[PDB]
Design a protein around this ligand. Structure first.
Ligand code: FII
Ligand code: ZN
Lengths: 6, 407, 323
C-alpha cells in the first residue's frame, strides 16, 4: 500500500 | 536500577496502554487491535529471543537504498511517474539528514533534470513534458535548495514562477493545485513555501489565504483539506506551516490545535496516527510531530511562559522507539508500519520525524534526546520547509539579493 | 475496444491505425536521475501519449489512448487534463464518461485525480442524481475514504441535498460508532442545517453523545465531538456537565473523562468561578495523574497544562512581587 499526497 | 528498563515501550506498565474495546467490537477496534498485536511482537522480540535490545539506525543500509534510488528506480515506481521531483526531494533530504554529501556530478545532474521538468510558463511538472503542478513545484524548489549551489538556485525562473502562482490563485484566498485541478490546503502551503524561499511574495499574492486556511480548522482542533472536512495531520501540517510562513498563526485557535495533535500520538505504539480512530503510520512522525516545533515557536512568540525549555510537547523517546524498532527495513529504507513495504516517501518522513524528536531548539536553548546508539543522531530539519535550517537560511539570503519580480 | 489487460492487447507500436505517428521518447537528459525502468507496456503507451499531446491531436484514437495511459498511472494529472480537453472537443457523451469514472474510482478510490474528474463531470452536467448512492457504495468498502467524504460534502452543499444525510450518518454510526469520519459528517450536517445554537438540537446532541460514551467509554471520537460542540460557547457555561461526568468516574472512567474534567476546570478558572483555589488544585491533581499514570504518552502536554493553570490561576498569580 502507498500513502497518497498528490 | 538493575530491574529498570530504559526503553519506554518495553516497561511492564506499558502493557496497560493496550486498547480497551469495552467489549464492543467495530471495524475500528479490530483494526487497531491487529496493529497493536504486531507491534507488541516487535517490542517483545528481544525478550523472547533473550537478547539485550540495541536500537540502531541502519545508516549504511539506508544510504545504499538512497544512493541507488537517486539514479534508477524499478517499475514499482511507475505510479510515481508524475512525481519525479518528489523522488529527488525525498532522496536528497534523506541523504542530508544522514549527513551524506551530495557529489557535484549528482547535484548538476539533478539540476539539469529539474530544468527539464520546469514549465515554459512557470512551476515544475511531475516529469519532462508534464504540465506544472504545485506539489512537484514545491518538491523541485526544496530539492534545488538542498543542493544550494548557484546552479541550483539559477534553475528557478522566478518571474514565471510568480506568474504561475497567480494563475492558480482563487478569489476566496485558496489556490488550485494546477490548472483545471483541485483545491485543498496543500496548495496554500506549496505556494507559500516556494514563494517565501525564492522571495517573490508580492503585497497581494496571499490575500485571503490566511483566512481561507483558518476556515479549514474544524471542531476537532486540527485542520482538514477544505472547510468542513475531518482534521488530518497532512493537511494540518500544511495549514499551520503556511500560516507560519505568512506570520498569521494567530488566525487559528492554537490551543485546540495543540490539544488535537498531542492526542494523535498512539499510547501503545508511540508513533502518530493521521486522524482520530485510524492507524499509526511512520510518515506522521513528521506531519504530526512536526507541528509541535511550529506550535512551540508560535506560543513562545506570544510570550507563553509555561513552555518547556528542553522538550517538544510530545513523547520524543516513544516516537524514536517506534521509528527505530518498527519502521526500518533490514535491506534499507523506512516504512509506514511493520508489514508494509519500504518506499522513498516513508524513508524521507520517518527520518525527518526522527530528527525532530532528537532535537529541541528554542533560540539559545538546545537539548537533544538520542535513543539507542549515539551514531543514531541525524542532522536537524527546519520544521516549516523540511530541509536543513542552513539550506533555508542560505537560500532565502541568496534570493533576497534579487528583487521581487516586477519590483 | 482493447482493454489494457486483455490477453490479446497489443503494443501501440504494433497497431496499424497508429502507423502514421512517430512515438515521442521521454526527454530525461544525457545522464538521468530518479529514472524509472518502465515496463514495455507503460513506456509504449506513454511514448504515444507524448506524441498526441505534442501534436495536440484531438481525435477519437487519442481519446481511447488516454484511458490506457490512465489505467497505467491514474495519478498522471497531465493525461487527465488532456482527456478533459478531448471530452469537450470531441463532444463525447458525458454520461458514458460518468460510467467510466465510476468504474475507475471503484478500482482506485484513494486517488485525487479520479475524484476531481468526477466532480468536473457533475459540474458540467449539473446533475447530482447519482452521487450520494455512488459515494455510499465506495464508503461501504472503506467507510473512512477521505476523498469520498470530501466529494460527498461538496455534492450535498452545492446541490442542497441535506434531507437524508443525518439519517445516513446515524446508520454508519450504528455500524461503527468509532468512525471519526462519520462524527465529522454529523457535525457538518448539523452546523449547516439547524446549527447548534438551537437549544433543542444542542441538548439532543449531547444526550446522544453521552449515551454513546456510556456504551463505549473509551471511544475517543464521542469525547472529541462532545467537547467540539460545547467548547465554543464555553464548557463552564454548562454547570450540570461537570457533575454528570463525575458520575461516570466509577464504572466509565478513561483518560478521556479525566482530560475533559481538566478542560471544564480550565474554563471555569478562565471565567472567575467560585472557589477559584479548590478548582485549580482539583485540576493540577488530575494533570499529574494524567502525566504520571493515566496518560503518560502525553506527559509533556499535561505538564504544560498544569504549568499554565499554575501560571495564571494560583492565588499568587495576581499578587505583586513586593507583597
Ligand atoms: C506538501 C504536501 C503535498 C503535503 C501532503 C500532506 C499529506 C500527507 C496529506 C494527506 C492527504 C490525504 C489523502 C489524506 C487522507 O488520505 N489518507 C489516508 O487515508 C491515510 P490515513 O488512514 O492515515 O488517514
Ligand atoms: Zn504514511
Amino acid at each position: 500500500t502507498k500513502c497518497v499526497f498528490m | 536500577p538493575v530491574w529498570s528498563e530504559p526503553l519506554y515501550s518495553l516497561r511492564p506498565e506499558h502493557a496497560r496502554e493496550r486498547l480497551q474495546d469495552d467489549s464492543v467490537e467495530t471495524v475500528t477496534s479490530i483494526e487497531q487491535a491487529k496493529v497493536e498485536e504486531k507491534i507488541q511482537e516487535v517490542f517483545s522480540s528481544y525478550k523472547f529471543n533473550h537478547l539485550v535490545p540495541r536500537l540502531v539506525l541502519q545508516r549504511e543500509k539506508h544510504f545504499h537504498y538512497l544512493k541507488r534510488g537517486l539514479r534508477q528506480l524499478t517499475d514499482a515506481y511507475e505510479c510515481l511517474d508524475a512525481s519525479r521531483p518528489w523522488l529527488c526531494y525525498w532522496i536528497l533530504h534523506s541523504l542530508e539528514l544522514l549527513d551524506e554529501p551530495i557529489p557535484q556530478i549528482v547535484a548538476t545532474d539533478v539540476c539539469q533534470f529539474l530544468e527539464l521538468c520546469q514549465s515554459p510558463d512557470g512551476g515544475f511538472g511531475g516529469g519532462p513534458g508534464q504540465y506544472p503542478h504545485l506539489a512537484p513545484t514545491y518538491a523541485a524548489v526544496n530539492a534545488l535548495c538542498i543542493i544550494g549551489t548557484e546552479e541550483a538556485y539559477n534553475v528557478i525562473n522566478r518571474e514565471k514562477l510568480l506568474q504561475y502562482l497567480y494563475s492558480l490563485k482563487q478569489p476566496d484566498g485558496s489556490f488550485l493545485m494546477h490548472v483545471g485541478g483541485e483545491v485543498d490546503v496543500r496548495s496554500a502551503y506549496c505556494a507559500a513555501s516556494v514563494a517565501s524561499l525564492t522571495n517573490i511574495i508580492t503585497p497581494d499574492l496571499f490575500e485571503g489565504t490566511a483566512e481561507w486556511i483558518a476556515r479549514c480548522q474544524n471542531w476537532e482542533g486540527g485542520i482538514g483539506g477544505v472547510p468542513g472536512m475531518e482534521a488530518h495531520g497532512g493537511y494540518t501540517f500544511c495549514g499551520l506551516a503556511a500560516l507560519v510562513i505568512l506570520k498569521k498563526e494567530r488566525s487559528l485557535n492554537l490551543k485546540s490545535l495543540l490539544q488535537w495533535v498531542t492526542s494523535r500520538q498512539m499510547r501503545f505504539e508511540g508513533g502518530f496516527q493521521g486522524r482520530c480512530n485510524k492507524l499509526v503510520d511512520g510518515c506522521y512522525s513528521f506531519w504530526q510531530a512536526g507541528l509541535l516545533p511550529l506550535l512551540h515557536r508560535a506560543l513562545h512568540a506570544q510570550g507563553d511562559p509555561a513552555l518547556s525549555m528542553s522538550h517538544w510537547m510530545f513523547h520524543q523517546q516513544a516516537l524514536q522507539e517506534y521509528i527505530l524498532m518498527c519502521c526500518q527495513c533490514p535491506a534499507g529504507g523506512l516504512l509506514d508500519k511493520p508489514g508494509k513495504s519500504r518506499d522513498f516517501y516513508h524513508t524521507c518522513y520517518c527520518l525527518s520525524g526522527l530528527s525532530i524528536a532528537q532535537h529541541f531548539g528554542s533560540g539559545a536553548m538546545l537539548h537533544d534526546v538520542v535513543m539507542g546508539v549515539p551514531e543514531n543522531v541525524l542532522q536537524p530539519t527546519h520544521p516549516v520547509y523540511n530541509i536543513g535550517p542552513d539550506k533555508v537560511i542560505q537560500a532565502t539570503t541568496h534570493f533576497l539579493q534579487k528583487p521581487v519580480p516586477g519590483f | 475496444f482493447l482493454s489494457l489487460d486483455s490477453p490479446t492487447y497489443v503494443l501501440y507500436r504494433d497497431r496499424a491505425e497508429w502507423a502514421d505517428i512517430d512515438p515521442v521518447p521521454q526527454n530525461d537528459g544525457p545522464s538521468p536521475v530518479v529514472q524509472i525502468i518502465y515496463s514495455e507496456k507503460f513506456r509504449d503507451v506513454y511514448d504515444y501519449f507524448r506524441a498526441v499531446l505534442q501534436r495536440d491531436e484531438r481525435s477519437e484514437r487519442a481519446f481511447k489512448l488516454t484511458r490506457d495511459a490512465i489505467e497505467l498511472n491514474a495519478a498522471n494529472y497531465t493525461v487527465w487534463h488532456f482527456r478533459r480537453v478531448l471530452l469537450r472537443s470531441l463532444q463525447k457523451d458525458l454520461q458514458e464518461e460518468m460510467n467510466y469514472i465510476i468504474a475507475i474510482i471503484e478500482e482506485q478510490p484513494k486517488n485525487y485525480q479520479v475524484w476531481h474528474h468526477r466532480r468536473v463531470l457533475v459540474e458540467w452536467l449539473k446533475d447530482p442524481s447519482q452521487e450520494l448512492e455512488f459515494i455510499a457504495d465506495i464508503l461501504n468498502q472503506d467507510a473512512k475514504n477521505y476523498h469520498a467524504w470530501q466529494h460527498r460534502q461538496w455534492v450535498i452543499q452545492e446541490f442542497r441535498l441535506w434531507d437524508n444525510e443525518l439519517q445516513y450518518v446515524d446508520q454508519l454510526l450504528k455500524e461503527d460508532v468509532r468512525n471519526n469520519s462519520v462524527w465529522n459528517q454529523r457535525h457538518f450536517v448539523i452546523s449547516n442545517t439547524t446549527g447548534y445554537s438551537d437549544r433543542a438540537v444542542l441538548e439532543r446532541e449531547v444526550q446522544y453523545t453521552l449515551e454513546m460514551i456510556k456504551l463505549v467509554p473509551h471511544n475517543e471520537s464521542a469525547w472529541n465531538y462532545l467537547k467540539g460542540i460545547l467548547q465554543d460557547r464555553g464548557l463552564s457555561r454548562y454547570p450540570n456537565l461537570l457533575n454528570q461526568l463525575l458520575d461516570l468516574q466509577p464504572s466509565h472512567s478513561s483518560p478521556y473523562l479525566i482530560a475533559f474534567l481538566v478542560d471544564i476546570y480550565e474554563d471555569m478558572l478562565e471565567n472567575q468561578c467560585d472557589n477559584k483555589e479548590d478548582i485549580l488544585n482539583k485540576a493540577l491533581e488530575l494533570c499529574e495523574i494524567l502525566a504520571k499514570e493515566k496518560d503518560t504518552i502525553r506527559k509533556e502536554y499535561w505538564r504544560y497544562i498544569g504549568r499554565s493553570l499554575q501560571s495564571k490561576h494560583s492565588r499568587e498569580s495576581d499578587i505583586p512581587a513586593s507583597v
